[PDB]
């Protein structure tokens, strides 16, 4: 990221600090938790509303020293008042602006926001799981401010969980008790805390909605798949992701050795000696070196991250992914709660930045074999069958004689998001009570109000609605400003926070108390449906046929001779 964006961010960070000081009040409040009393503070928003804020509530033991890479443990209870008037640090990670490592191994906290501590009826509990490809992210308010949501009568919670190798290292040796998915196991324990404590903040433990975007979406879906959380929450929203996206799991049992080797390990490839080295290494060194772990082979086959969710090699007490996610959908308790899923109108437009450093990537569309789903493609990607599936992909996205950048980002929309959504829906239908699932397509484009990911994807002065563009209309961030109440931006904030809160309350996303939903008839998808219907959210809210359907079906034809792999 450029020096000018660096300094610009530095100045906004300085601005956000003083703003946060100003928007703070002296009104402190004490709530009960099952671990002891916590002191929160009331704060202001730029829209002249206020809210109670409890930050840095621990839901797990600090996972340092001998607990590193291990499943989380329940925290130690205290008797007195824990000061929750300040945020704790983020999980250790590389800063996407600066390039330097930040955060701390002590990161397992959550935040609890609400406009009213003593509501007359118990309220909807909304739980946000942040994305960041399982390697970056945080529940800090400079990135995920509750300011828009607190206008509604909800309780909003933002959790943290261990990222990267600290979050997702995996070892085969059953004696070492590092099966993997520690970061997901962090998510489970936070949920059990939210289950048993949200009533103290006026939340209804019998009406909890979990939702997330990107890796946050795959996390939400994983939380709906595992037995570990059965009956813990009642609604799910999957925003641009799910657990069968190609980036959302990986078999990383061999990659620990690679990481130890990068970090100074001298010796052989056996799991014990590797683990001991990794247990003593500096967290910043491990995190800094994750970038270099993936081979060229793996990047070529679109492996995006070294460490992430995985099928655990042996079953433990806290086990979360005991089989491949596609197998877990067939037995998921989550299949039987109300669900909302959706994508933006130009997801892949995110990858513009990556394309600029790697022009050659566009020539991949010449045969498209590198985008054939891994389970169908052969090793070298050279088998005649593979070139044939590749061709079905190329016919779907390449518009002219020669491939363009827009063909490429268009392909990515489908490779990383639409096609996996298609596969989940169909697979889910075969194994479900028949609870509704509702689709949205977020199609609203504005540059007047942005979020930090625009800095990352180099999204300055770029039209179209990229992945993460919708976060701007759900949370406050330190790049935001107050918008006039008549602006298209402000109205979309109202609509978005409105629908989500409507869905969270009733398990049904429609309300005629939302401006623009007058002629809207939003039906759930039926297995009988050849074509998916979705609410398209632009300046106007309109039900349409999913425009990506024709391409979606083309991808499906790759499985013609392999329908059991679908």
Alpha-carbon Rg for the chain in angstroms: 23
Helices in 23-126 by DSSP H: which ranges? none
Please give the torsion angle defined by the CA atoms of residues 395, 399, 400 and 406, in that order, rounded to the nearest 10 degrees: -120
Domain count, the chain: 1
| Angle, CA 222 vertex, CA 537 and CA 141 arms, to 5° | 60
CA distances from 473 to 123, 348, 395 (A): 22, 20, 35
Dihedrals phi, psi of 210, to nearest 5 degrees: -95, 135
Contact 303, 250 (CB under 8 A): yes
Helices in 136-246 by DSSP H: which ranges? 141-144, 164-168, 182-197, 215-225
CB count in 10 Å sphere of residue 1: 15
Domain enclosing residue 171, as ranges: 1-566
Q: Which two tokens stand for residue 474?
A: 């759900």
Within 214-290, strands assigned E span 235-239
Contact 80, 37 (CB under 8 A): yes
Residue that has been written with the tokens 């070139």 in this structure? 387
Q: Which two tokens stand for residue 254?
A: 């061999």
The H or E element containing residue 355 is: helix 352-357
Q: Which two tokens stand for residue 263?
A: 């970090």
Residue 401: is it exposed, middle or buried by C-beta count within 10 angstroms (0-12/13-18/19+)? exposed
Residues annotated as catalytic (active site), given as ranges? 214, 347, 467
Interhelix angle 271-280/255-262, rounded to 10 degrees, is 50
Residue 79: is it exposed, middle or buried by C-beta count within 10 angstroms (0-12/13-18/19+)? exposed
Per-residue DSSP letters for 12-48?
A: HHHHHHHHHHHTEEEEEEEE--TT-EEEEEEEE-TTS
Task: Indicate which CATH number applies to the domain containing 170.
Answer: 3.40.50.1820
The whole-angstrom distance between residue 220's C-alpha and the CA centroid of its chain comes to: 7
* Largest pairwise CA distance in the chain: 71
CB count in 10 Å sphere of residue 48: 7
Q: Both ends of the chain: CA-CA distance in Å?
A: 39
Q: Rounded to whole angstroms, how far apart are CA atoms 434 and 441?
A: 22
Q: Rounded to whole angstroms, how far apart are CA atoms 454 and 143?
A: 13
Q: Rounded to whole angstroms, how far apart are CA atoms 532 and 549?
A: 7
Residue 500: is it exposed, middle or buried by C-beta count within 10 angstroms (0-12/13-18/19+)? buried
Q: How was this structure determined?
A: X-ray
């Amino acid at each position: 990221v450029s020096l000018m964006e660096k300094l610009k961010w530095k100045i906004k960070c300085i601005e956000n600090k003083f703003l946060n000081y100003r928007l703070t009040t002296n009104e402190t409040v004490v709530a009960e938790t099952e671990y002891g009393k916590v002191k929160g503070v009331k704060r202001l928003t730029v829209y002249d509303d206020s809210y109670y804020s409890f930050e840095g509530i621990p839901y797990a033991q600090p996972p340092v020293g001998e607990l590193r890479f291990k499943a989380p443990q329940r925290p130690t209870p205290w008797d007195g008042v824990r000061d929750c008037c300040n945020h704790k640090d983020k999980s250790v990670q590389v800063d996407f602006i600066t390039g330097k490592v930040c955060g701390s191994e002590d990161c397992l906290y959550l935040s609890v926001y609400t406009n009213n501590l003593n509501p007359e009826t118990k309220r909807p509990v909304l739980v946000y799981i942040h994305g960041g490809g399982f390697i970056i992210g945080e529940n800090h308010r400079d990135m995920y401010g509750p300011d828009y949501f607190i206008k509604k009568d909800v309780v909003l919670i933002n959790i943290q969980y261990r990222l990267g190798a600290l979050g997702f290292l995996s070892l085969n040796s059953e004696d070492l008790n590092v099966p993997g998915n520690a970061g997901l196991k962090d998510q489970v324990m936070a949920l059990r805390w939210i289950k048993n404590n949200c009533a103290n903040f006026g939340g209804n433990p019998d009406n909890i909605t979990v939702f997330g975007e990107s890796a946050g979406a795959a996390s939400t879906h994983y939380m709906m798949l595992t037995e570990q959380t059965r009956g813990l929450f009642h609604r799910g929203i999957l925003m641009s992701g799910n657990a069968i996206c190609p980036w959302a799991n990986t078999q990383c049992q061999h990659r620990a050795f690679t990481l130890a080797k990068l970090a100074g390990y001298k010796g052989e490839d056996n799991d014990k000696d590797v683990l001991e080295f990794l247990m003593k290494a500096k967290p910043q060194d491990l995190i800094k070196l994750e970038e270099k772990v993936l081979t060229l082979e793996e990047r070529t086959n679109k492996v995006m991250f070294p460490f992430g969710p995985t099928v655990e090699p042996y079953q433990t007490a806290d086990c979360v992914l005991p089989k491949h996610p596609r197998e877990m959908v067939k037995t998921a308790w989550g299949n039987s709660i109300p669900t909302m899923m959706g994508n933006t109108s130009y997801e892949g437009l995110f990858f513009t930045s990556i394309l600029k450093q790697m022009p050659l990537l566009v020539k991949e569309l010449e045969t498209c074999v590198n985008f054939v789903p891994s389970e169908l493609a052969d090793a070298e990607r050279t088998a005649p069958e593979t070139l044939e599936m590749g061709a079905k992909i190329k016919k779907a996205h390449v518009t002219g004689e020669t491939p363009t950048a827009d063909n490429f980002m268009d392909l990515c929309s489908h490779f990383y998001f639409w096609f996996p959504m298609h596969r989940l829906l169909q697979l889910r239908f075969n194994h479900t009570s028949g609870t509704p699932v509702y689709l949205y397509r977020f199609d609203f484009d504005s540059e007047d109000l942005i979020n930090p990911y625009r800095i990352m994807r180099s999204g300055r002065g770029v039209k179209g609605v990229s992945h993460t563009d919708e976060l701007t209309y759900f949370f406050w961030n330190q790049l935001a400003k107050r918008m006039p109440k008549e602006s298209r931006e402000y109205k979309t904030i109202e609509r978005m926070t409105g629908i989500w809160t409507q869905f969270a309350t009733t398990g049904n996303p429609y309300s005629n108390e939302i401006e623009g939903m007058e002629n809207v008839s939003w039906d759930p998808i039926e297995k009988s449906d050849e074509v998916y219907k979705c609410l398209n959210i632009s300046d106007e809210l309109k039900m349409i046929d999913v425009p990506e359907m024709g391409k979606i079906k083309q991808w499906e034809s790759m499985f013609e001779k392999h329908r059991d792999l679908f």
